[PDB]
Amino acid sequence: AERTPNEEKKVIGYADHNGQLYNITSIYGPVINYTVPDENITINTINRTQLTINYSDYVREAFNEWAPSGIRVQQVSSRVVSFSTTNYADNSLGSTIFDPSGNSRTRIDIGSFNRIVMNNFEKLKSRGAIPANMSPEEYIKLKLRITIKHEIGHILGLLHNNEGGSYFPHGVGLEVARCRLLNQAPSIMLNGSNYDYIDRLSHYLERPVTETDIGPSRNDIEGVRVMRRGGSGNSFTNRFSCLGLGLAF
Amino acid sequence: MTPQNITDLCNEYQNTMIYSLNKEIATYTESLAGKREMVIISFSNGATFQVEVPGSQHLESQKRPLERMKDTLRAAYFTGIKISKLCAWTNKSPNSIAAIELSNL
Amino acid sequence: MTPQNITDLCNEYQNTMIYSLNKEIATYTESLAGKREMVIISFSNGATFQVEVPGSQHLESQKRPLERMKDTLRAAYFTGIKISKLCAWTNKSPNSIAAIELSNL
Amino acid sequence: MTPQNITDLCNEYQNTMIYSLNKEIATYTESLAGKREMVIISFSNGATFQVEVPGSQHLESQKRPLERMKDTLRAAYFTGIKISKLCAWTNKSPNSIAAIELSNL
Amino acid sequence: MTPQNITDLCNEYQNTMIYSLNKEIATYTESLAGKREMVIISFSNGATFQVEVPGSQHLESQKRPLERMKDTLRAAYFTGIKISKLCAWTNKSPNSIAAIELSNL
Amino acid sequence: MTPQNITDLCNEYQNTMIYSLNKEIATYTESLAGKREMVIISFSNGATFQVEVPGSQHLESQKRPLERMKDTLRAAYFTGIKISKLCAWTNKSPNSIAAIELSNL
Numbered sequence: 001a002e003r004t005p006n007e008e009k010k011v012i013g014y015a016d017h018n019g020q021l022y023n024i025t026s027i028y029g030p031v032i033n034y035t036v037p038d039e040n041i042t043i044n045t046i047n048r049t050q051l052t053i054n055y056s057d058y059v060r061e062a063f064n065e066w067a068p069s070g071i072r073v074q075q076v077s078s079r080v081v082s083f084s085t086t087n088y089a090d091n092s093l094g095s096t097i098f099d100p101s102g103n104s105r106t107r108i109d110i111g112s113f114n115r116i117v118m119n120n121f122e123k124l125k126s127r128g129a130i131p132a133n134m135s136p137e138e139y140i141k142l143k144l145r146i147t148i149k150h151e152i153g154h155i156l157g158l159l160h161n162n163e164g165g166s167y168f169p170h171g172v173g174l175e176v177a178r179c180r181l182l183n184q185a186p187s188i189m190l191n192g193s194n195y196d197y198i199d200r201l202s203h204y205l206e207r208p209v210t211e212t213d214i215g216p217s218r219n220d221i222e223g224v225r226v227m228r229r230g231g232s233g234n235s236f237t238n239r240f241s242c243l244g245l246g247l248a249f
Numbered sequence: 250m251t252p253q254n255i256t257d258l259c260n261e262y263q264n265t266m267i268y269s270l271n272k273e274i275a276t277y278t279e280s281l282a283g284k285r286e287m288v289i290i291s292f293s294n295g296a297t298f299q300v301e302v303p304g305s306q307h308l309e310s311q312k313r314p315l316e317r318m319k320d321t322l323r324a325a326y327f328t329g330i331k332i333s334k335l336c337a338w339t340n341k342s343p344n345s346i347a348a349i350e351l352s353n354l
Numbered sequence: 355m356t357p358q359n360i361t362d363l364c365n366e367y368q369n370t371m372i373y374s375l376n377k378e379i380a381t382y383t384e385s386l387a388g389k390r391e392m393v394i395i396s397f398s399n400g401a402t403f404q405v406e407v408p409g410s411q412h413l414e415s416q417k418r419p420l421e422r423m424k425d426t427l428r429a430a431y432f433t434g435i436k437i438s439k440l441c442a443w444t445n446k447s448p449n450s451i452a453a454i455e456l457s458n459l
Numbered sequence: 460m461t462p463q464n465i466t467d468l469c470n471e472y473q474n475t476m477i478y479s480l481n482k483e484i485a486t487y488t489e490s491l492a493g494k495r496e497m498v499i500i501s502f503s504n505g506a507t508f509q510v511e512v513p514g515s516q517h518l519e520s521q522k523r524p525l526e527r528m529k530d531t532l533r534a535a536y537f538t539g540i541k542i543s544k545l546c547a548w549t550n551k552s553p554n555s556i557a558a559i560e561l562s563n564l
Numbered sequence: 565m566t567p568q569n570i571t572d573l574c575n576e577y578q579n580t581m582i583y584s585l586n587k588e589i590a591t592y593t594e595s596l597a598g599k600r601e602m603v604i605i606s607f608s609n610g611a612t613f614q615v616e617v618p619g620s621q622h623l624e625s626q627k628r629p630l631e632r633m634k635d636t637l638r639a640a641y642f643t644g645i646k647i648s649k650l651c652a653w654t655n656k657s658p659n660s661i662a663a664i665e666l667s668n669l
Numbered sequence: 670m671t672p673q674n675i676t677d678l679c680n681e682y683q684n685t686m687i688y689s690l691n692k693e694i695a696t697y698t699e700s701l702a703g704k705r706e707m708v709i710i711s712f713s714n715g716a717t718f719q720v721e722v723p724g725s726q727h728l729e730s731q732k733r734p735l736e737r738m739k740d741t742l743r744a745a746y747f748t749g750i751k752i753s754k755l756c757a758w759t760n761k762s763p764n765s766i767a768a769i770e771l772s773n774l
């Protein structure tokens with residue numbers, strides 16, 4: 001694996017208006033209760049490709065990806081977390097509203113998925129970023145998993161890698177869990193406006209990417225660990241996740 | 250006999266006391282000014298300690314340990330780790346650090 | 355005679371001033387060129403400081419502390435830790451660092 | 460015969476033993492007190508080790524290695540890395556560290 | 565007029581030039597082989613620099629700064645931080661480092 | 670001439686070889702035991718290297734570089750960084766490290 005640039009390993013947590021990181025244990029409880037409609041997400045794109053998917057099942061896998069942070073979840077039938085489907089066709093695959101009251105909400109846009117998903121498929125497959133083998137169905141599976149795990153990151157108090165210092169509805173982004181000394185995959189919380197996560201992960205792995213490769217990076221996990229205890233964004237225990245390695249020098 | 254822990258060690262010296270802190274360093278002060286080549290640390294409750302300027306009270310065998318201790322305290326400050334205990338001489342102001350314990354128990 | 359903090363220390367020397375920065379180091383410059391073996395740091399507002407080339411103005415007891423301060427400044431730069439205060443001699447250009455305070459408070 | 464690993468190395472000395480630990484250091488104690496300039500580490504099961512005060516039992520060639528080992532143990536403590544094995548002299552209390560092995564995935 | 569920055573410093577020497585990189589070190593090479601005790605670094609664009617083997621061209625006052633610069637370069641390499649500028653002598657191959665600037669600006 | 674890279678350097682010595690590893694250190698062993706003051710590293714494929722005990726085969730100019738290399742290897746082990754190449758003397762067992770290359774290219 002190549003060396004991921006520091007900017008792609010940088011993780012930003014959601015702080016309030018007083019520079020204090022939101023505590024997601026305090027927000028969701030020790031166990032995060034969440035709801036999903038009757039699953040059955042269906043995608044229809046043309047170039048044609050159809051695909052049906054259990055929202056419940058894909059959310060389940062995504063949450064499990066984040067389990068190393070020490071979080072625990074609980075699917076509950078419809079102040080709790082909501083996963084929903086929308087059809088704005090907004091050139092936006094997914095979106096999340098982080099609510100300190102516990103009612104954080106994540107949406108997956110079918111209209112956007114139907115329109116714009118395949119727009120980088122052939123571009124990537126030629127770059128060697130995804131296998132020439134990969135089917136159009138698997139690619140839509142891949143993008144959906146990435147999208148859900150990425151939005152889960154937002155649910156767990158993370159923002160985008162490049163949003164340190166930027167202002168948000170409930171406060172400001174502050175870097176958490178910094179670790180530049182340990183090589184690792186790019187964060188799944190890369191700003192999608194500025195990065196192609198699949199492309200960057202492929203650059204890191206020096207080979208095409210599969211579903212088993214994607215997921216929260218080491219720093220992503222450490223970031224949520226910080227969000228699970230909150231406190232000052234200025235605390236060194238919050239700001240750094242491997243500074244002890246400095247002693248080895 | 251050789252001490253097994255900071256309390257045994259601290260009891261081998263006069264004018265010393267064990268401070269149980271379990272707190273991170275709040276302020277770190279480092280001076281290179283002549284005759285004040287020293288480090289001072291304080292905790293959130295106001296407790297203040299120094300590593301003394303090297304002097305005639307120090308054995309030759311203590312010269313490198315003085316520097317090691319200053320290294321350890323700076324690293325503790327930067328990482329924000331909790332200090333478990335300090336053994337300090339009370340006949341200096343600020344109290345002067347003789348030994349440190351870090352514990353994750 | 356018994357300084358407790360950087361204000362006390364700075365008041366024990368002539369020609370010094372305190373700068374309250376509460377900012378990370380913006381630029382770190384290190385030179386090994388002969389007769390200019392020094393470190394210069396600057397902050398986002400342009401405030402600039404040096405650790406002086408070792409010279410006749412330094413006691414033997416200050417030689418290792420000069421090196422320690424350069425170590426501390428480099429570590430602060432790399433980690434982005436905020437510098438709370440610097441006590442500096444004003445009769446050098448850039449102002450010459452005598453002491454540093456780091457505070458998380 | 461230059462050893463290839465810690466077991467072979469440990470077997471080149473009398474009164475030594477290998478401890479297979481595979482655990483993090485639980486407590487780190489560092490002293491600059493005169494005649495007790497030493498580091499003591501312990502593990503959660505109570506097993507305790509020292510880096511000895513430099514003394515007549517040490518070759519000149521061992522003086523810097525003693526300091527290196529204390530650096531390594533401090534780094535191990537701060538990072539929480541597992542210690543794989545220690546080779547220790549059993550004719551001292553705490554047992555005295557001769558060599559350390561760190562091993563990963 | 566005392567130097568305030570790396571450009572001022574570099575202008576105080578013959579045969580030097582400022583190289584602006586704003587890149588992390590791509591390759592770090594360290595040798596302990598006799599008469600080649602040196603460090604070589606290179607960037608992704610192929611630009612290559614050395615810290616020279618200590619020799620008769622160095623003042624006694626440069627001996628510790630040579631070691632400090634090698635420490636700084638190693639730390640920069642491991643942390644992947646951007647190097648802003650190097651001041652280097654052009655009459656050595658690879659170009660020989662006189663000073664370094666790190667900037668987060 | 671001055672080498673531009675580790676291969677050039679390695680070609681300036683007899684009984685040396687370049688090993689291309691692109692692997693992290695699997696095991697790190699450090700000894701302070703008298704006459705065996707050394708570091709040994711191994712990789713997951715069993716490949717083993719030493720930094721030799723300082724001896725008559727070393728120039729005075731190599732004494733600090735031996736210690737630097739041991740520092741670098743310890744940092745490499747702790748961070749799990751991949752080692753790109755080693756230049757090693759093959760007339761020692763384990764092969765003895767002359768130079769190291771770390772590369773993110």
Ligand SMILES: CC(=O)N[C@H]1[C@H](O[C@@H]2[C@H](O[C@]3(C(=O)O)C[C@H](O)[C@@H](NC(C)=O)[C@H]([C@H](O)[C@H](O)CO)O3)[C@@H](O)[C@H](O[C@H]3[C@H](O)[C@@H](O)[C@H](O)O[C@@H]3CO)O[C@@H]2CO)O[C@H](CO)[C@H](O)[C@@H]1O[C@@H]1O[C@H](CO)[C@H](O)[C@H](O)[C@H]1O
Binds near residue numbers: 261263264301311345
């Ligand atoms: C209390 C004191 O004066 N300490 C100074 C020390 O004096 C020596 C003896 O003190 C002890 C001690 O520090 O408590 C006694 C301990 O049992 C010893 N412990 C061990 C494990 O060895 C320590 C230890 O040897 C030294 O600290 C290491 O250098 O020493 C003290 O009792 C003894 O007093 C004599 C006295 O001098 C004389 O007038 C009278 O006739 O007899 C008394 C009883 O025999 O003197 C000992 C030295 O000859 O000496 C050291 C330097 O040698 C320091 O001066 C030490 O002062 C402290 O130094 C600390 C830093 O090292 C720190 O700065 C403290 O603030 C100082 O007070």
Ligand SMILES: CC(=O)N[C@H]1[C@H](O[C@@H]2[C@H](O[C@]3(C(=O)O)C[C@H](O)[C@@H](NC(C)=O)[C@H]([C@H](O)[C@H](O)CO)O3)[C@@H](O)[C@H](O[C@H]3[C@H](O)[C@@H](O)[C@H](O)O[C@@H]3CO)O[C@@H]2CO)O[C@H](CO)[C@H](O)[C@@H]1O[C@@H]1O[C@H](CO)[C@H](O)[C@H](O)[C@H]1O
Binds near residue numbers: 282443
């Ligand atoms: C002010 C000055 O010139 N400082 C130089 C110093 O001179 C000594 C006395 O100055 C103080 C001081 O630096 O302020 C006075 C303080 O109360 C002392 N504080 C403490 C805690 O001890 C300090 C301290 O002792 C020294 O800095 C440690 O080395 O010293 C100064 O007042 C005194 O002046 C004499 C004068 O020389 C003489 O012509 C006249 O007849 O009497 C005057 C009053 O007694 O001289 C003292 C030394 O003999 O000396 C040191 C060298 O020991 C330095 O030269 C210092 O210059 C500063 O050095 C800094 C780095 O250490 C930095 O580079 C500054 O830029 C230098 O000006």
Ligand SMILES: CC(=O)N[C@H]1[C@H](O[C@@H]2[C@H](O[C@]3(C(=O)O)C[C@H](O)[C@@H](NC(C)=O)[C@H]([C@H](O)[C@H](O)CO)O3)[C@@H](O)[C@H](O[C@H]3[C@H](O)[C@@H](O)[C@H](O)O[C@@H]3CO)O[C@@H]2CO)O[C@H](CO)[C@H](O)[C@@H]1O[C@@H]1O[C@H](CO)[C@H](O)[C@H](O)[C@H]1O
Binds near residue numbers: 474515521705
């Ligand atoms: C066992 C012992 O007493 N160790 C002390 C050592 O004594 C030397 C010989 O011991 C060995 C050893 O340590 O086991 C024998 C090994 O084969 C040697 N290994 C290698 C790779 O060289 C080591 C090694 O050379 C030294 O440790 C390096 O300094 O030495 C010991 O067998 C020999 O005993 C003599 C005895 O002295 C004599 O009166 C009797 O008539 O014959 C015996 C057999 O020939 O003496 C050797 C020294 O002349 O010496 C060192 C200092 O050189 C230390 O004192 C060592 O004590 C240990 O030191 C450790 C730290 O280095 C630690 O503190 C332990 O707690 C000490 O026991």
Ligand SMILES: CC(=O)N[C@H]1[C@H](O[C@@H]2[C@H](O[C@]3(C(=O)O)C[C@H](O)[C@@H](NC(C)=O)[C@H]([C@H](O)[C@H](O)CO)O3)[C@@H](O)[C@H](O[C@H]3[C@H](O)[C@@H](O)[C@H](O)O[C@@H]3CO)O[C@@H]2CO)O[C@H](CO)[C@H](O)[C@@H]1O[C@@H]1O[C@H](CO)[C@H](O)[C@H](O)[C@H]1O
Binds near residue numbers: 579
């Ligand atoms: C250019 C050169 O040969 N540099 C060598 C230097 O020579 C001294 C004078 O050069 C400067 C310089 O390096 O540019 C001139 C600067 O103004 C000085 N700057 C400052 C801030 O002091 C520096 C500085 O003093 C030294 O670098 C510190 O050691 O020196 C040079 O002009 C002068 O030349 C004499 C000449 O020797 C004589 O035959 C002729 O008739 O008159 C000339 C003008 O007076 O000689 C000075 C030394 O006597 O000397 C140092 C050793 O002190 C080095 O040899 C230096 O070579 C560079 O060293 C670098 C590492 O330090 C690096 O390896 C470069 O690759 C070397 O070329």
Ligand SMILES: CC(=O)N[C@H]1[C@H](O[C@@H]2[C@H](O[C@]3(C(=O)O)C[C@H](O)[C@@H](NC(C)=O)[C@H]([C@H](O)[C@H](O)CO)O3)[C@@H](O)[C@H](O[C@H]3[C@H](O)[C@@H](O)[C@H](O)O[C@@H]3CO)O[C@@H]2CO)O[C@H](CO)[C@H](O)[C@@H]1O[C@@H]1O[C@H](CO)[C@H](O)[C@H](O)[C@H]1O
Binds near residue numbers: 721731761
């Ligand atoms: C091959 C060898 O024995 N190396 C030992 C070295 O011997 C010197 C000459 O060897 C080289 C070398 O190491 O390959 C030749 C290179 O071109 C030199 N390269 C550069 C860039 O200078 C190096 C270098 O100078 C030294 O390594 C730095 O100290 O030296 C060797 O060819 C020469 O042989 C003589 C021979 O001794 C004599 O009997 C015969 O009649 O003539 C031959 C041709 O002149 O001897 C040179 C020394 O006078 O010497 C150093 C100590 O200075 C070491 O002993 C070195 O052994 C290696 O040391 C390594 C650690 O530095 C490591 O432990 C290796 O395992 C040792 O073999």
Ligand SMILES: [Zn+2]
Binds near residue numbers: 150160
């Ligand atoms: Zn996002």
